Amino acid sequence: TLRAAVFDLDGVLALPAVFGVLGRTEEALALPRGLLNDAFQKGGPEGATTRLMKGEITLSQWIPLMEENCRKCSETAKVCLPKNFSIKEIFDKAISARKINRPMLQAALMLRKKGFTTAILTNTWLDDRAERDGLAQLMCELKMHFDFLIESCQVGMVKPEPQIYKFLLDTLKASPSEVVFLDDIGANLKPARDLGMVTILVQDTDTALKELEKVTGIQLLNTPAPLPTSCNPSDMSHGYVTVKPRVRLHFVELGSGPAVCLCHGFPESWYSWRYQIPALAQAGYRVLAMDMKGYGESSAPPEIEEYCMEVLCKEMVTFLDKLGLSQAVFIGHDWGGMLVWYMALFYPERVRAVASLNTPFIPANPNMSPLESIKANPVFDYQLYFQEPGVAEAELEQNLSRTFKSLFRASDESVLSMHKVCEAGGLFVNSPEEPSLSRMVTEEEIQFYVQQFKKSGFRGPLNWYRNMERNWKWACKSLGRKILIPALMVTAEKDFVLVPQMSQHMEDWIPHLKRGHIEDCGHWTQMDKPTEVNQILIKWLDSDAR
């Protein structure tokens, strides 16, 4: 019975194949059929291409050798190579044109999710071209979805030599009968077959996947739309910056390019952006997913005033200073969304662009107490419950698993009614002791939040709500200003606290404001609708933030 799946790169995980480019070049230049492909394979195992595939020579060293083989081939075929014939040009173009075959990767992802050991076995070269980064990026994106990547040029062995197959089996720790092997080259598939492995000759992806699902007994074709890539906390780069003597800020970092600072809500973690971190990095950005003050690995001082917007924003500026960042794009959700509008109002020179999920920008009312304002809205009643130091902590800290299972629910699974929370004396007074697992979260994801909250609890997080008068006074200083930097407001249809209509008057203060809207989405935007969050954010980043 099968437990491992092996995939080739060219013509299997990446399309179009390089072999298909040499053929297309012959057709385009009106060269004799197979002339280029013949020069490419000249001398077979003793040839320059074998030396290249084994790692004896680099791609740049190979270009002149291929040129000589092409001249030799044209001499025998009694033909002439065109005036400006260039192998460098042909290969640069071929390599650049090659993209990931998404449904093949999806099938590999599914087999791995169902327990398979997945591997990439490829005949490749050591790329030293000026444009090598494209291929490096491709390999980077691909390799992280697999248990092993076996490259001919690194192992000094090549397909179809029998030793590379015995090497593959040794790294898989699997007998041939337990392995599926997919290849577009019949000759390279032959030694795997001879060893007793299940083999698939890949021509078109659809037929290959039919053969693959028939042989594994796992649905790979016509499958539901998959979730975006998530994060394994232990595989991330973890960063730490001291912003002041008793305060350290933790963050997870991924990708290269313009700095994108992610700011979570209450009661969350850097991990609330797990479905956005890989996507934004992949889109050409350097992601900095924060553990906000009072959360996870960041410091959680006990004093209420350590959590007023003025100090939180100042500390985020210091965070940029210490990292050597003159700017970052600030993307926030919930309480993070509020911080982010305040970063744009008080430090526009430090904010490349600003985006908020669910949280609208509403200017302070100088004629009314924030206490009065909160009482005017019945959904904002649970905020009065959060005021008394200790009361909400005791309930939230009592059973951590219960807390996150009760809170982190999709729009159609609600267990909480935020009207009369004070009257009823708590958020979970009509919630079960053992809530069911929401469709948005796995048991393991809940246990990550439980472990994070075991360090500091709910004092620091609840203190974000305990600075109303202080935040109101500070916000009143910005009443004459406008947000004129690039800005995005994302509303969530089914968020019954941060309702889309609460954002209706935003253009009076943010005239150039851009919008996004997510149908059938509750309060937990990022995990509720990850695919659509990523699509809105990426489109806005490439257009307005660079």
Ligand X SMILES: CS(=O)(=O)N1CCC(NC(=O)N[C@]23C[C@H]4C[C@H](C[C@H](C4)C2)C3)CC1
Binding-site ranges for ligand X (CB under 6 A): 266, 334-335, 338, 359, 382, 407, 418, 497, 523
419 catalytic, yes or no? Answer: no
The answer to whether 366 and 297 have CB atoms below 8 angstroms apart is no
Distance CA 183, CA 44 (A): 20
Q: Closest CB to a second copy among 34 and 348?
A: 348
Q: Per the structure block, which two tokens stand in for 502?
A: 């609460």
Where is the binding site for substrate, in residues?
382
Where is the binding site for phosphate, in residues?
122-123
Q: Closest CB to a second copy among 462 and 485?
A: 485
Q: Closest CB to a second copy among 12 and 260?
A: 260
Distance CA 489, CA 341 (A): 10
275 catalytic, yes or no? Answer: no
Catalytic residue (choose from 285, 295, 307, 465): 465
Which of ligand X, a second copy, none sits in contact with 352, Cβ below 5 to 8 A by type? a second copy
Give the CA distances from residue 79 to residues 37, 90, 210, 358, in Å, rounded to whole numbers and listed in that order: 15, 19, 44, 67
Element (H, E) at 138: helix 133-143
Q: Closest CB to a second copy among 33 and 481?
A: 481
**Among 1, 466, 12, 37, which residue's Cα sits nearest to residue 218?**
1
Q: How far is the CB of 149 from a second copy (least distance, A)?
A: 10
**Among 253, 264, 271, 265, which residue's Cα sits nearest to residue 451?**
271
Strands 99-100 and 14-15, how do they pair? antiparallel
**Could you list the residues that contact a second copy (CB under 8 A)?**
51, 55-58, 60-61, 126-128, 132-133, 135-137, 139-140, 143-144, 154, 156, 234-242, 253-256, 259, 281, 286-287, 321-327, 346-350, 352, 477-478, 480-485
Which of a second copy, ligand X, none sits in contact with 382, Cβ below 5 to 8 A by type? ligand X
Which of a second copy, ligand X, none sits in contact with 167, Cβ below 5 to 8 A by type? none
Q: How far is the CB of 469 from a second copy (least distance, A)?
A: 18
Helix 87-97 crosses helix 133-143 at what angle (to 10 degrees)? 30
Phi, psi of 136 (to 5 degrees): -60, -45
Which of ligand X, a second copy, none sits in contact with 481, Cβ below 5 to 8 A by type? a second copy
Q: How far is the CB of 284 from a second copy (least distance, A)?
A: 11
Q: How far is the CB of 55 from a second copy (least distance, A)?
A: 7
Which of ligand X, a second copy, none sits in contact with 256, Cβ below 5 to 8 A by type? a second copy
Full 3-state SS string of 321-353 = HHHCCCCEEEEEECHHHHHHHHHHHHCHHHEEE
For the chain, percent helix, then strand, then coil, each to nearest 5?
A: 45, 15, 40
Q: Closest CB to a second copy among 350 and 409?
A: 350
Name the DSSP class of 104: H
Where is the binding site for Mg(2+), in residues?
8, 10, 184
523 catalytic, yes or no? Answer: yes
Catalytic residue (choose from 334, 342, 495, 528): 334
Triad 15, 16, 19: Cα angle to 5°: 130
Q: How far is the CB of 310 from ligand X (least distance, A)?
A: 14
Where is the binding site, in residues?
8, 10, 122-123, 184, 382
Q: Closest CB to a second copy among 3 and 132?
A: 132
Phi, psi of 237 (to 5 degrees): -85, 120
Active site residues: 334, 465, 523
